[PDB]
Symmetry: C2
Subunit: 604 residues, 2 copies
C-alpha cells in the first residue's frame, strides 16, 4: 500500500520542542503543575521513572532514554519515507525533512548525554541511589537547582504526626517539628514539643481540657441578618404611631450593613438600595402589610428583614465566593485531629504568603522563624481561634498580623489588599490541590509565570536536563551543539510549557493547508494562480510544490483544465528551468520521467 | 466642532441585550423567563424580574437596566449612523462597503419590526393586562403566553419541592416534579410559622433525619483512604500483629486484603485501576517483612495493623490515587444532622436529586411520570428516608441509594428499563452542578431547569433562560397579527445547531474583521512586490459577487497609491485583460492621483 504513514508524534514524555525547533528535555523534580503532589518518601518517584522507568498502578512507565530512543526510531522512519520520494521529486518535503533531521540530531545527543551521565558521572552513586536507596534522595544536582531557583520554593510544616523523611532540604518557610515517631524505639507515636507555632495552633484550637472551639460560619445573608438583629431586642416591633419611621430605620440599617459587607468583595454594590421594589414600588408599611400581606404589626424584626430582602435584592447578590479552605462545613473544632488539620491550614497560608513575598522580591525572610517565637506563636493562634468563633474570615487575621509586623518580616511595606487577595487565591488553589496528601510535612511550590530555572510541563514540575547535566558533570562534558539550548528556553514567553509540540504538528497542518489551497484554486478554475501558488516559496525559500503527494498530484494532473495549466507552464518565462522540468515530470502524464508520488497520512 | 477628523467610527456593537444574530444574518429577540444558564436563579416572588426588565426596564443594585424596546432603539440608531457613514463614501466609491452596508440594512429592517411588534403587543393585545401586571399590584405572575411556552417545552421543566418553611408564592404552575407541601406561613393569620402536614416525602425526610426526640444522625463520611483503612481493619482486632512465626504469611494476607479493597473501591470510579498492585514498590522492590522492618525501619513486631497499612500504602500507592471526586452536595463537611434546619437542608437535597432524575428521564423520553407522586406515597416516602439515613451513618454515597430505589421500581415510574450506571452518573453531574448553582437561594420551593443541549423551545442566552419573542408574540396575540417578514424566523432558530446561543454576534463582528483581513492582504501583497496579484486580489470578489476593493479606506488607498510599485500597479491595470471597464475606472479614480475624479476615502475605525 503506497502510502507514507508519518510516525513522529506530536507529544512525547519529557520533550518540549520550541518554535525555533530546538529540542529541550525537562528533568522532573516532582509531579504537579504549581504545587507538588509528591513529598516526603515519594519525592524521588519522578526521577526514578525518568532514569529507570517504573510500574505505576501495574501499568509500565518507560525511562526518558527508552522513550527518546523510540521517538528517534519514528523520526528515522519518517526521514526514510520522505527520502523514498526523492527519486520522484527532488525537493519532496524539503522543510518537513530538515525539521525532522534537526530534531533527530538533537534527540540523539540527549540520548548520548543521559548515557554518559549514568556510565561516567555517577561515581558517587547519586543517580543510582534512586534505584537502590531505601528511601531515595534527590540527586545533588537537583538540590542545587532548587537552592538557586528564583521561582520555586519548598515549605516545611509541623503536622502533629510528622514524618522524618522530608526530602526538600532548603525550604523557604520552615517551622519547628515534633520528634517523628520514626525516631522512637517502637515507631508508634510522635514525641510532641511544647513550643512554636504548630503546638500553639493545636493546643489552642483544641485544648487539653477538651473544650471544643465552635465554628460559627454564617452565609452572607445570615451574617447581615443577625448582625442587624443584634442592635434590636426580641420584643421589638414595627408597630405604633412611629411605625413608618421605625421601618425606615430598619431599612437604612439593613442597607448599610448589606452594602458594607458586600463592598469588600465587590464595590459595584456601593450603590445598592432597599428603599424600593424592582418595578420602582416603595418599600413601606402599607405595601408589605396591606398589599403584599407578608408581615404585620406583630411580626418579628427578623420576618420584616426577610421580607425586605426578598422584595428588593436580586438572588445574584447571595451567591458565595469560592469557600476558604478554613471553612469546610464543620460546626466545631472538637478533636486533636480537627485541630491538627486547621493548624496545617494556617501554617500553609503563612507559607504561601512567605512564597508570595519571596518570588515578588519583597522579602527573603523565613516567616516561620518569626511565627515560631513567642508571643507571636501564641497571639496568632488566639486571634485565629477567636476568628472561628466570630465566624470571621481567617485570611485577613493572618494578613493584619503580618502587616503589623512588616519590618520584622523583611518587608519595606505592608501587603496591599490586592497582594492579599492574590495570596488567598494561590493558597486556596494550592491547598485544595494537596488536601488529600497522606503527609503535610512538606511541599514544593513553583510559579511558572515568573522568570527562573523551574518549569511546568506535562503535569511535572521540572528543570532543564542540561542545567542538571552540567552541574552534575561539573563542566567536564561540554554540550557541543546544545550549549545554548538552556539559555534559549529562558528566552521563551513563559516557564509554563505546552504539553504538545506545535512545531511538529504544524509540519502536518501545512501539508493539509497546501491541499486546501490546491482544491480551491482548481475549483475556482484560476490556473495562473495555481502555478504561482506552487512556485511560491516558503520563508526558507522552498517551493510549495515540495508538498505534492499522490492526492494533490492526481487532482492537478487529471483535472479539467490541466491543458490550460500546461499552457501556462511552457509560456511562463519567470519560472526557472529547474522547476518547469520538475513540475512537468510531476504533473504531466506525457512526461518521459513522470512518476507517482505516494499518498501521505498521519494520526491527528 | 471643526476638530472634525475624516474618520468613520462604526457604532454597531457586537453584543446587545436580548439580541442574537444568526449566521444567515437573521435577527432573533430572546424573551427571558428567568436568569440563569441551565438552572434558574430566580424563583417564587422574583420569578417575574427578567420580564419586568424586558418590557419596562428596572433598577438593580441602583444600576438602571433598560427595556428591550429602549435597547433595540439605541441599536437601531447606531445602525443608522453606520449606514449614513458608509453612504457618505459612495460619492467617492460607488461600491464602498457593499457587503457590510447590506448586512447592516438587513439587521436594521428586522430590528424595526421587532420594535414595532413589542409596541403593538403593549398597545393592542394586552387587554387582559397580562403584561401590564408585571408593573402593577402584587407579586406578578408569568404572562399566560410564557406559561404555555413552558407547558409545551420538551427541553425545560419546573420542579416543585417541600421546604419546611414553604412560600406559597410559587410562580411555576406546570412542574414535572411536584410533592406535597406544608401550609405556608403566609396562609396563617399571623404570617409567622408554617403548618406542617405529617404525610409525604418532605415530612418523612425531615422527621427521619432529625427526629422529634432530638437524637442526632451521625454523618460518618470518610476519605477513600480512611474508608479502605477502617474496612480492612474491621476484619482485624486491636491485638492482631504481624509477628512472628507466620509473619510473612500474615503480611501477605494483609497486602491482598488491602489490595482487593483498594481496587474494589477505586474501580467504581475508574477501571484503569483494575491492575493496581501493592506487592512491590515503584522500583520493583518487594514489599516484605525484611524491607519495611530491617531496611527501611518503619514498623516492627509490635506495630499495629493500621501502621503496617499506612506503610504499605505509602511505599506503594501514588499520591494521585487519593485525589477524591468533587464532593457530593450530600457531604458538606458536617459531622452530623443535629437540628430541624440541618434536616430540612438535607431533605431538600434528596428531593432535588429526585427532581433531576425525573428531569433526566423526561428530557431523554424515558418517562412522563411525576416521580414526586410516587415518592410522596407510603411506604416509599418512609423507606427512601430510612435508607438515606442509614446511608449517612455508613458514610455511603447517597446518590446510588436513590438510583437503586428508582430502579427497583422502574416500571411503576413509567420506565421500560432500569437506569444504567452511565445514566446514573449523568444525573449526578447535573444534580451536582445545578444544586451548587442554587444552594444559596433564599427559597427552595421551585426551580426551572432547562437543557439547552436538547431540541426544544427554550434557549440559553446571555445568562438568561429564554424563549423566542416571536413564540410569545404569536401566542399572546392569538394569531391575529401576521409576522410579515419575520414569519420564518422562529423556525430558523430551531434549524440552528444548539439552543445554547452565543452571547455576542459573530456575524456583526466579522463585518469588521473582514476589513482588517483585507488590509493585511493588501500590506502583504505590496511588501512582497507582486503587482498582478494585488490587482487580482482587489478585483476578486466575495460570494455575493462584490469586489474586494469595496473595502478600501484611507489607510489602504494611501498604502497602494503612494507605494513604490504604483507605476507598476498602474501599468498592469492598463494592460488590463481581465478587468471590466467600470472597475478599471473606479480603481483608477481611487488609486491614481492624476485621475480627474480622484478623491480620498475616510479612515475607518471601531471599538473591539
Ligand atoms: Mg514514610
Ligand atoms: Mg415572598
Amino acid at each position: 500500500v503506497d502510502v507514507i504513514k508519518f510516525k513522529e508524534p506530536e507529544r512525547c514524555d519529557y520533550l518540549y520542542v520550541d518554535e525555533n525547533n530546538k529540542v529541550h528535555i525537562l528533568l522532573p523534580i516532582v509531579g504537579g503543575d504549581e504545587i507538588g503532589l509528591d513529598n516526603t518518601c515519594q519525592t524521588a518517584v519522578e526521577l526514578i521513572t525518568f532514569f529507570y522507568g517504573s510500574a505505576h498502578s501495574g501499568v509500565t512507565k518507560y525511562s526518558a532514554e527508552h522513550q527518546l530512543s523510540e521517538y528517534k526510531r519514528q523520526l528515522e522512519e519518517d526521514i526514510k519515507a520522505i527520502n523514498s520520494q526523492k527519486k520522484i521529486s527532488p525537493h519532496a518535503y524539503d522543510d518537513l525533512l530538515k525539521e525532522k533531521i534537526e530534531r533527530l540530531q538533537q534527540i540523539e545527543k540527549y540520548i548520548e548525554l543521559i548515557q554518559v551521565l549514568k556510565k561516567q558521572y555517577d561515581e558517587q552513586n547519586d543517580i543510582r541511589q534512586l534505584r537502590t536507596g531505601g528511601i531515595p534522595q534527590l540527586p545533588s544536582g537537583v538540590k542545587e537547582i532548587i537552592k538557586s531557583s528564583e521561582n520555586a520554593f519548598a515549605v516545611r510544616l509541623s503536622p502533629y504526626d510528622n514524618d522524618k523523611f522530608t526530602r526538600f532540604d532548603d525550604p523557604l518557610f520552615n517551622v519547628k517539628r515534633n520528634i517523628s515517631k520514626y525516631d522512637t524505639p517502637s515507631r508508634q507515636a510522635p514525641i510532641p514539643i511544647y513550643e512554636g507555632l504548630g503546638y500553639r495552633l493545636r493546643s489552642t484550637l483544641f485544648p487539653e481540657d477538651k473544650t471544643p472551639t465552635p465554628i460559627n460560619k454564617k452565609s452572607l445573608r445570615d451574617k447581615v441578618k443577625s448582625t442587624v438583629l443584634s442592635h434590636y431586642k426580641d420584643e421589638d416591633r414595627i408597630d405604633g404611631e412611629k411605625k413608618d419611621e421605625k421601618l425606615n430605620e430598619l431599612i437604612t440599617n439593613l442597607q448599610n450593613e448589606l452594602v458594607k459587607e458586600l463592598v469588600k468583595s465587590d464595590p459595584q454594590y456601593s450603590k445598592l438600595s432597599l428603599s424600593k421594589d424592582p418595578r420602582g414600588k416603595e418599600i413601606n408599611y402599607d405595601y408589605l402589610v396591606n398589599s403584599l400581606m407578608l408581615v404585620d404589626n406583630d411580626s418579628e424584626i427578623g420576618d420584616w428583614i426577610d421580607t425586605i430582602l426578598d422584595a428588593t435584592v436580586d438572588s445574584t447578590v447571595w451567591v458565595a465566593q469560592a469557600s476558604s479552605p478554613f471553612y469546610d462545613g464543620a460546626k466545631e473544632i472538637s478533636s486533636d485531629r480537627d485541630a491538627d488539620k486547621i493548624s496545617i491550614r494556617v501554617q500553609y497560608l503563612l507559607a504561601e504568603a512567605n512564597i508570595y513575598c519571596k518570588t515578588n522580591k519583597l522579602s527573603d525572610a523565613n516567616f516561620g522563624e518569626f511565627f515560631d517565637k513567642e508571643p507571636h506563636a501564641t497571639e496568632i493562634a488566639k486571634r485565629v481561634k477567636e476568628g472561628f468563633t466570630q465566624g470571621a474570615d481567617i485570611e485577613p487575621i493572618i494578613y493584619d498580623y503580618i502587616n503589623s509586623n512588616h519590618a520584622e518580616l523583611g518587608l519595606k511595606s505592608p501587603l496591599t489588599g490586592k497582594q492579599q487577595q492574590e495570596i488567598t487565591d494561590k493558597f486556596t488553589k494550592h491547598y485544595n490541590t494537596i488536601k488529600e496528601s497522606p503527609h503535610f510535612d512538606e511541599f514544593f511550590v513553583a510559579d511558572p509565570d515568573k522568570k527562573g530555572n523551574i518549569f511546568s510541563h506535562q503535569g511535572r514540575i521540572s528543570c532543564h536536563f542540561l542545567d542538571f547535566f552540567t552541574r552534575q558533570t561539573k563542566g567536564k562534558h561540554p554540550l557541543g551543539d546544545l550549549a545554548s539550548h538552556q539559555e534559549a528556553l529562558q528566552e521563551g514567553t513563559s516557564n509554563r510549557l505546552h504539553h504538545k509540540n506545535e512545531v511538529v504538528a504544524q509540519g502536518y497542518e501545512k501539508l493539509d493547508q497546501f491541499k486546501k489551497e490546491v482544491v480551491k484554486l482548481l475549483a475556482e478554475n484560476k490556473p495562473k494562480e495555481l502555478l504561482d501558488y506552487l512556485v511560491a516559496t516558503s520563508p526558507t525559500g522552498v517551493p510549495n510544490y515540495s508538498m505534492l503527494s499522490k492526492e494533490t498530484q492526481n487532482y492537478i494532473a487529471y483535472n479539467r483544465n490541466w491543458p490550460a495549466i500546461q499552457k501556462e507552464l511552457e509560456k511562463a518565462t519567470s519560472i526557472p528551468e529547474s522547476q518547469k522540468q520538475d513540475l512537468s515530470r510531476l504533473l504531466s502524464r506525457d512526461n518521459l520521467q513522470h512518476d507517482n508520488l505516494s499518498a501521505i497520512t498521519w494520526s491527528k
